[PDB]
């Protein structure tokens, strides 16, 4: 269950709503209970660092849906048991549905 997602920080550095708030085009590598941010498929098969963070934990993961967030169609609101919030769009409903399935089965 790996694939390319945008990914966008709501919340990513204390502050109100994070410091930043960019759409991220990363390379999601679900794991048991956590979850591997990398390049693509080879940076994440190697083990490249990509980011600060590299494996994050979605043990107790929740999940909501976007399908209409202002430009972006397919999206979904997932946020960590962990603190950290996320914007995930996918390319399509299957896609997304998918994303989500998976998520909810940690």
Request: charged share 30%.
């Amino acid at each position: 269950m790996e694939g390319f997602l945008n990914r966008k920080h709501e919340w990513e550095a204390h502050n109100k709503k994070a410091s930043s708030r960019s759409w991220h085009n990363v390379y999601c590598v679900i794991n048991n209970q956590e979850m591997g941010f990398y390049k693509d498929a080879k940076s994440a098969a190697s083990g490249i660092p990509y980011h600060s963070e590299v494996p994050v934990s979605l043990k107790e993961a929740i999940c909501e849906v976007a399908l209409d967030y202002k430009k972006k169609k397919h999206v979904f609101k997932l946020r960590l048991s962990d603190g950290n919030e996320y914007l995930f769009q996918a390319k399509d409903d299957e896609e997304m549905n998918t994303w989500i399935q998976a998520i909810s089965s940690a």
